[PDB]
């Protein structure tokens, strides 16, 4: 699960568990892409709450308001987050996962946590800078942001989902998360 | 809102933002932020605002604003007389309610009564450009204080203003290329700064569609 | 303010003004800095009979070291009873100023329709005023006063044997024994005032070297004031005979002064001020027929940083032509720009 | 007192004099409104040494706005040591005035026998006075002092040569280097005094255009006073040699000035005052013989409302004639009555 | 500091000086008692904006009771922000005076090369000075300032058809529109200063034979100071063109004047002083080739009792010789000794 006092330790443990599960069950992911999402739920979804990380997907639109717009950012967002994490994990074909040390974060509302991933085919390293936040409602170390290779991808859809919400409202993105979560992962094929 | 000229206005934007920006504007922005001291930059910023103060007050009077019209008049009088030509922010520290305000050109008055936006064209070496706001800015050249500036000195102020605003945008330059299509987010960003309630420039930095509304009820939302 | 003991309180005050004039006349432009110094004391003799005093002094700081230009503005003292009125003797304001005080709230160009020691139109010497407040405690806003003037004539010991007094001056600011009174009323935000004064003229003022003849000069005035909801709107009409100084060469036989002011108060400190002044002096006994004494429009704004310092600007639009009569009198006919800083402590 | 810091005591005193004159002689008729302004600070360097200093100013408020009259009354500084004396240099009072101050106790009149800068008779300029208290702490009430006077000549603005000083004056106010002293004794109620002074006369004071020639101007002045049981009695007779100014002609060769006053203090503040002064000459020149320079009787009362504001009425009756001697010297020969109130703070 | 309420601060300062000059020259011998009086207020408007003012008066106490010798020294007002510098308009000191004040350490003498109202070198009228401290809060000890001047010239009321000003004076203090600035560097005792001045002169300044003529007048200053370990050493040399007044003859085209002071404040109050002044005149007109205008050495000491009371003796040895140039100009060429007594409060 996620720790309540050390956010860096929880992130390092979650990254190691995800890498070990993918390597130990590599044939399972290829045989069934949906199976990788279930395994990622106990590795990457526990470390980042749906409500805490409700900015990358259905952040500006849908949200948890409007009575019926609840299965896009709070209820069904756990499966969508696992599917997104599973697709990225399935892209690698044996990439090494480096766990960062337990750096001192202190008492603050913004706890930046980053990891290092080195591919074995010679590709440039990708840094997963999952920033955590000490939310009062949820005491677990849940990441409030998702940054890949140094780029702030947490707010990528924040400024892009407003165009669809200006006409269809918050109900237009309610089914967007359901289709993404139900969609299987696409593993990268070597050419 | 759909806009004409879909074939054009795309290649020019890419060339202006991926070739001219990281080769000329970017190297000069780093030196300006570091080599030029902060008090020097602050003095230049207030000088540009003072030259447009006797011009934005007329815009408020045309639409009707006795309270806001006198606010700009006091700022110009104090900056020119008690600040030696507006080199310092005399009115900024004189009253907490008399701080710096975004200038309101002739385009604000036109949009208050309701005018069409028209086509959008990205002028070279200028960036965003529109016929109603940017194209309607050629109306204050007959008023005093602004007519005293010739073509070479006037264009220098525009370059200085762009350089000053580049320093504040250097810290958040990663979001420009974060989106798949940078042209889409740039057009919406400029439109959101000139299509507020009853025009009047841009509104406060907030998002109407339920901004930070789910953070107050995350106790039972984060459990799933 | 600086001393409060044994029932005596002293309120030291003043104001230092650094002012500059911008005009093409080359006669009033340049440095015009000046400072005001004085105190305002008050002593409580008993529970009913009180007393107070006031003194002022203006020193011009634009002069050189070899020249000094200083004068006393007001200097008077007297007692003040609880409910029967107050009486003070000394250098104080006249009776016409009690009604004209509502239309001279302009920052710099104020009170240009009269002059000091001129038929009880401004501050004068030897003024004995008896003023009663609230009509002996009967109605609110109804105030009245009665003033008397001494005798001032030719300078003492300088080639003069008739009309000589210990405080003699030139004939341009001479006046005899006169009596005047002013009545004002303010019920709720609306003010109504009117004063009637009459002062005798000395023998030196009846010579043939100056225009204007008559044994007694009578002055009439009247105006309305409105100061409510941070809005100022006042206008007054004045009709004086042989009282207003038309530049040099004595006074006009008949002048019809008209003043109107308008001011607004903002929440941040800016106080715009727009006023119009008119002076149609007719019945001139020197062939000049109907002429204009003073007519200009002043537009400006005053910004108050705090209760002890403020900044103001002014723009005097002089629309009066410069004919032969104006040149001889010496009245400015061109625009003058006034701007300066005031620090009141 | 507006400053009470550690050894930085400062007292700000002053008053406003609102008075009016009524007399047959128009040369003094009118108003004599003036005011007094100045500070008075005292320091404390050590347990024994003590520093002090005061300044007084007087400006006449009866003048117009085109001119003003200003002069410094007293301006001096010095140190005071415990039971050994004190020396201060500057504009101070003479040693003779220490005994003469018991006579001129009237609110407005009194002290008309002499004039300003009349050697050691009133407040002079360039006075170096050394004063002692209680005779080095030996006896009580016995005090003595000495004074030295500087030399003043013609102003340096115009070519006069001979004796010219920076602080130049006219030919009727110059003085030379003189030495003076005074001895006073203060008993229980009763009091006696005596002063002897002598000032050198410059070459511009004994010309052919002024009556009275000589080199020395030694003067002798006595004194008697009694301040007990709320009554005031004072008598003083003095002999002046070539130092009493008579009109504007010059100085009398020998004059016998006698003066005596009597004042009573009431419970409610009434202070009646009576005084008699004579200035009959003895050895006048240019045809004058046994001519009275000044002779008048002053009777009046003073009402004390409190310690700050007081009212008084004065009535002076001139007992001298109006012959050619008084007309030539321009001496007032008419009764003067002045009433008013003063406010001191 | 006699008033401190709701952010308003008023400070009263001044001194009394009794001077008795001893010299053979008749134009300077005699009493020279003067007094300084003024106030210094400061109002805190906001946290980052504070208002302030300054005023001072000088009244000579050596005059008689019928003459006035009072004049103003400094009278200006301005606003001060948190850290941008300081700007004030009014009667203030020039930019040159900010650098040349290092050698102006003598109690009474010193700084005789320049004069009052001599362009932007001392106090004057219509002075607009902007002073910045610590270079907008960037470095320590590096300060610079700029100044502006008016166009005061001939008096308006003198019947002159040429350029005139309301606050006019004689043809010895007029100045046109000019600009000036100064830069100063501070350190642990050591100091570097320098000022550059250039002001236009009116046409009336060079109408008659005024020795020195020119369209513009330039002034370059510079000096070093050392104030550490109770040691005061300063030396400033400047070269001015048509900016130093020779006297009653006119102006000097070229003037090379250098001054240096040396002081060492002892622990027991005494503060001995030693200064030297020199002024060389070059390119003079009317046949004068090369002569010295002013050259003397001042030796003296100052003894402050605790903080304010001080007694000082001065003796300046004049090295100049009597000739035709000094007689026509009117400059003393003899050694003088001055004694004073300053009581500050
Ligand atoms: C606090 C900050 C500290 C400083 C900061 C920066 C440092 C430096 C700043 C100043 C440097 C300026 C450059 C300079 O300083 O320049 C050079 C120096 C060279 C370079 C050095 C640079 C150094 C840099 C240092 C940098 C350091 C960082 C020398 C010089 O000084 O040049 C001189 C000229 N320039 C200036 O003086 C400064 C300057 C002129 C100023 C410009 C206009 C005024 C602006 C407004 C002020 C703002 C208020 C705050 O410069 C200009 O241009 C514009 C320059 C822009 C900046 C100006 C800022 C001034 C304000 C100061 C800040 C408060 C000046 O020209 C003419 C001027 O005449 C007018 O009077 P009139 O009223 O018209 O009569 C006005 N007069 C003034 O004083 C202005 C005013 O009073 C003073 C204002 C400031 C004072 C303090 C105010 C602050 C108060 C604050 C209180 C809180 C003025 O404006 C005018 O139009 C009219 C009027 O103002 C305009 C109306 C005003 C409206 C304002 C109100 C609005 C408020 C807004 C509220 C909403 C006009 O310009 O005179 C001679 C020319 O000689 C003649 C000539 O040809 O005219 C020859 C002669 O003519 C003949 C003929 O042939 O006809 C020949 C004869 O034989 C004979 O026949 C006669 C015939 O009998 C009769 O005529 O006539 C004769 O007439 C003579 C005189 O008249 C009489 O002796 O003048 C030049 O000498 P020259 O060049 O060396 O040869
Ligand atoms: C609180 C304490 C109070 C006091 C305590 C004691 C009380 C008693 C004091 C007074 C008694 C003294 C005796 C007396 O008072 O004596 C008699 C009275 C007799 C009875 C006395 C009884 C006493 C009773 C006591 C009671 C005890 C219980 C009358 C009289 O006063 O005698 C008179 C003389 N004596 C004095 O005045 C006092 C006296 C003066 C002497 C000066 C001493 C120096 C001052 C000390 C300063 C103190 C320092 C702190 O002397 C002295 O006894 C020395 C004693 C010192 C006394 C002063 C000290 C006071 C200061 C106290 C401070 C603590 C005086 O002689 C000449 C004086 O001239 C100079 O001017 P110049 O040089 O030109 O500038 C100087 N002028 C001064 O004023 C001095 C100065 O300004 C004032 C003094 C200071 C006062 C204030 C100071 C306080 C300030 C402090 C502030 C905090 C002065 O010194 C000089 O030179 C030198 C020069 O200063 C420079 C001095 C150097 C400075 C050094 C200081 C630095 C120190 C260093 C410290 C580290 C010199 O003495 O003049 C006539 C003479 O007539 C003539 C003449 O012949 O000259 C005739 C005529 O000439 C002719 C000619 O032939 O040329 C003839 C013609 O036919 C014709 O031809 C024309 C020809 O065409 C053109 O010429 O002219 C004509 O010229 C005329 C006038 O000039 C113009 O009308 O004078 C005499 O009349 P007469 O004899 O009766 O007939
Ligand atoms: C705050 C209080 C409340 C408000 C005030 C009160 C309310 C209203 C005011 C009263 C109303 C009427 C006033 C008026 O305004 O009245 C009328 C008005 C008409 C109606 C208008 C409205 C009225 C109703 C309004 C109702 C409103 C509700 C017109 C006018 O004004 O009439 C005028 C007359 N009356 C007055 O001015 C008011 C008035 C004058 C004053 C009277 C004295 C009263 C004493 C004061 C009391 C003190 C208080 C404590 O009298 C009086 O009514 C008495 C009344 C008392 C008034 C004083 C009030 C003081 C109040 C103070 C309270 C504390 C005046 O007569 C003469 C005056 O001259 C003197 O100077 P001199 O003696 O020379 O030195 C005295 N001059 C004064 O100023 C007095 C003084 O300075 C001021 C007074 C006080 C002011 C300040 C007080 C406060 C002080 C401080 C207080 C803290 C004065 O007394 C004297 O004698 C001497 C002296 O006072 C009296 C003696 C002293 C004793 C008293 C001491 C008491 C001690 C107390 C001890 C316990 C005497 O009266 O002059 C012309 C006449 O023209 C001539 C003439 O014929 O004489 C022509 C001409 O002559 C000829 C000739 O033939 O010789 C003809 C030629 O052809 C030719 O030949 C030549 C020839 O060649 C050469 O000569 O000359 C020529 O000479 C000229 C001049 O001399 C020179 O140009 O004068 C008249 O003009 P006209 O009638 O219109 O034509």
Author numbering:
A (entry chain F): 1 to 191
B (entry chain D): 11 to 234
C (entry chain A), D (entry chain C), E (entry chain B): 23 to 367
From the reporting publication:
We exploited the strong in vivo disulfide crosslinking to trap transient interactions between MlaAQ205C and MlaCV171C and effectively isolated such OmpC-MlaA-MlaC complexes from overexpressing cells, followed by purification on size-exclusion chromatography (SEC). We reconstituted these OmpC-MlaA-MlaC complexes into lipid nanodiscs assembled using the MSP2N2 membrane scaffold protein and E. coli polar lipids for single particle cryo-electron microscopy (cryo-EM) analysis. Initial 3D reconstruction without application of symmetry operators revealed three distinct classes of OmpC-MlaA-MlaC complexes, varying in the number of MlaA-MlaC pairs bound per OmpC trimer (i.e. OmpC3-(MlaA-MlaC)1-3). Consequently, combining particles from these classes yielded an improved density map of OmpC3-(MlaA-MlaC) with an overall resolution of 2.9 Å. The membrane-embedded components of OmpC3-MlaA were well-resolved with side chains clearly visualized, while the density of bound MlaC was limited to 5.0-7.0 Å owing to continuous flexibility. In our nanodisc structure, we can clearly visualize the MlaA donut positioned exactly at the membrane-water boundary of the inner leaflet of the bilayer, with the C-terminal part of the protein protruding into periplasmic space and connected to MlaC at two contact points. Unbiased rigid body fitting of the MlaC model alone in the density positioned V171C adjacent to Q205C (on MlaA), exactly consistent with the engineered disulfide bond forming one of the contact points. In addition, we were able to trace and fit a poly-alanine model of the C-terminal tail helix of MlaA into residual density not occupied by MlaC, accounting for the second contact point. In the final real-space refined model, the manner by which the C-terminal helix of MlaA interacts with MlaC agrees with the AlphaFold2 prediction and strongly validates our biochemical observations, solidifying the idea that this interaction is critical for MlaC recruitment.
